[PDB]
Design an enzyme around this catalytic site. Structure first.
Site, PDB file in Angstrom:
ATOM      1  N   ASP A 192      -9.122  -0.333  -2.939  1.00  0.00           N
ATOM      2  CA  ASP A 192      -8.661  -1.534  -3.626  1.00  0.00           C
ATOM      3  C   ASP A 192      -7.303  -2.008  -3.150  1.00  0.00           C
ATOM      4  O   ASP A 192      -6.932  -3.171  -3.348  1.00  0.00           O
ATOM      5  CB  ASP A 192      -8.578  -1.277  -5.121  1.00  0.00           C
ATOM      6  CG  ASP A 192      -9.914  -1.390  -5.805  1.00  0.00           C
ATOM      7  OD1 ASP A 192     -10.869  -1.946  -5.198  1.00  0.00           O
ATOM      8  OD2 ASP A 192      -9.999  -0.932  -6.969  1.00  0.00           O
ATOM      9  N   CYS A 224     -14.983  -9.802   6.278  1.00  0.00           N
ATOM     10  CA  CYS A 224     -14.532  -9.166   5.064  1.00  0.00           C
ATOM     11  C   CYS A 224     -14.575 -10.246   4.000  1.00  0.00           C
ATOM     12  O   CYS A 224     -15.641 -10.797   3.758  1.00  0.00           O
ATOM     13  CB  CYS A 224     -13.144  -8.546   5.216  1.00  0.00           C
ATOM     14  SG  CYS A 224     -12.062  -9.347   6.386  1.00  0.00           S
ATOM     15  N   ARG A 230      -9.362  -7.063   7.652  1.00  0.00           N
ATOM     16  CA  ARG A 230     -10.303  -5.952   7.812  1.00  0.00           C
ATOM     17  C   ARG A 230     -11.211  -6.171   9.007  1.00  0.00           C
ATOM     18  O   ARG A 230     -11.520  -5.239   9.755  1.00  0.00           O
ATOM     19  CB  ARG A 230     -11.137  -5.757   6.545  1.00  0.00           C
ATOM     20  CG  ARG A 230     -10.324  -5.367   5.325  1.00  0.00           C
ATOM     21  CD  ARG A 230     -11.236  -5.006   4.172  1.00  0.00           C
ATOM     22  NE  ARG A 230     -10.533  -5.003   2.897  1.00  0.00           N
ATOM     23  CZ  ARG A 230     -11.094  -4.666   1.744  1.00  0.00           C
ATOM     24  NH1 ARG A 230     -12.372  -4.290   1.698  1.00  0.00           N
ATOM     25  NH2 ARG A 230     -10.381  -4.697   0.635  1.00  0.00           N
ATOM     26  N   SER A 231     -11.637  -7.420   9.171  1.00  0.00           N
ATOM     27  CA  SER A 231     -12.476  -7.809  10.308  1.00  0.00           C
ATOM     28  C   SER A 231     -11.741  -7.569  11.599  1.00  0.00           C
ATOM     29  O   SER A 231     -12.321  -7.044  12.540  1.00  0.00           O
ATOM     30  CB  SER A 231     -12.898  -9.265  10.191  1.00  0.00           C
ATOM     31  OG  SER A 231     -13.568  -9.452   8.953  1.00  0.00           O
ATOM     32  N   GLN A 268      -4.163  -8.404   9.965  1.00  0.00           N
ATOM     33  CA  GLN A 268      -3.290  -9.155   9.121  1.00  0.00           C
ATOM     34  C   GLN A 268      -2.029  -8.499   8.628  1.00  0.00           C
ATOM     35  O   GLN A 268      -1.016  -9.102   8.528  1.00  0.00           O
ATOM     36  CB  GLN A 268      -4.072  -9.637   7.953  1.00  0.00           C
ATOM     37  CG  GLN A 268      -3.280 -10.465   7.082  1.00  0.00           C
ATOM     38  CD  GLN A 268      -4.088 -11.051   6.058  1.00  0.00           C
ATOM     39  OE1 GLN A 268      -4.925 -10.424   5.516  1.00  0.00           O
ATOM     40  NE2 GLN A 268      -3.870 -12.273   5.791  1.00  0.00           N
TER      41      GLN A 268
END
Length: 287
Positions: A192, A224, A230-231, A268
């Site tokens: 999370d 994502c 995440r990608s 990111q």
């Protein structure tokens, strides 16, 4: 040459890691900061159109024009060609990946049309639909075996396999008598907050993915929620794991630089950038 590339000798990777992470990641932080403007001066014209406004999850996350995936125009629609997605380079092709946002209910028909028009045979999903009670992604695929129609694309689960950190699903894709098989690789274990910890779980997924998919000649769809952090992490990881088979060097930085030119915020955060390094260190050290 070191403006858009910092190659590292694999045999030296452990020391490079140590030097880079010393002093609360000073060097890692410095290095990652260098990438902050990369790509950001490129127009996002179509993403900005009033007709496309409802098709973006986040106003700040928009596909560059030069790079975006274009859906086939449908007669008399402003923007029927638009989806929040971009071609992103990989190990094997400058257009190996199409990275995109987690579809909205509003956009999942578009998402499936893209999969179909791209001739993609593989989707990588790096988010849960809901995290901390926030919706990050529509449930765009069936939750059982009854085929569901998304636009003209009929989708049907042929089988699925559950694992500790991912679910693998084999869809039959039908479209007016044309039939394809697509695989869906869903990492369901991202925390999370922060990054996967221990990072080894992500390496296991990337390994499982690449082992299954092979040298795919057709675009691989990756998302994502925003389709950037995440990608971006998964792609970089998938490249370098291939790379270390055929080279003496790895260029995580150069990889991230290149991704940036093609889609905003590719990896990111600085934490994901350090994470990629940690995953690779785990591999080179025999976990």
């Amino acid at each position: 040459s070191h403006m858009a590339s910092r190659p590292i000798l694999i045999k030296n990777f452990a020391e490079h890691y140590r030097l880079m992470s010393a002093d609360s990641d000073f060097r890692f932080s410095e290095e990652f900061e260098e990438l902050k403007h990369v790509g950001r001066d490129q127009p996002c014209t179509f993403a900005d159109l009033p007709c496309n406004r409802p098709k973006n999850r986040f106003t700040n996350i928009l596909p560059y024009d030069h790079s975006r995936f274009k859906l086939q125009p449908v007669d008399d629609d402003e923007g029927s060609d638009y989806i929040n997605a971009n071609y992103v380079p990989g190990h094997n092709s400058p257009r190996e990946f199409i990275v995109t946002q987690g579809p909205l209910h509003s956009t999942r028909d578009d998402f499936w049309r893209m999969c179909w028009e791209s001739n993609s045979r593989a989707i990588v999903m790096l988010t849960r639909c809901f995290e901390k009670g926030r919706e990050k992604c529509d449930q765009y695929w069936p939750n059982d075996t009854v085929p569901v129609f998304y636009g003209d694309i009929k989708v049907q689960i042929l089988n699925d396999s559950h694992y500790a950190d991912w679910v693998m699903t084999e869809f039959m894709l039908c479209r007016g008598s044309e039939q394809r098989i697509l695989r869906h690789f869903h990492f369901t274990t991202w925390p999370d907050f922060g990054v996967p910890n221990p990072p080894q779980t992500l390496v296991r997924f990337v390994r499982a993915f690449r082992d299954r998919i092979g040298a795919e000649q057709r675009p691989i769809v990756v998302h994502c929620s925003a389709g950037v952090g995440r990608s971006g992490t998964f792609i970089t990881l998938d490249r370098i794991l291939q790379q270390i088979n055929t080279s003496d060097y790895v260029d995580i930085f150069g990889i991230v630089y290149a991704m940036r030119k093609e889609r905003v915020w590719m990896v990111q955060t600085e934490q994901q950038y350090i994470c990629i390094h940690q995953c690779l260190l785990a591999v080179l050290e025999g976990k």
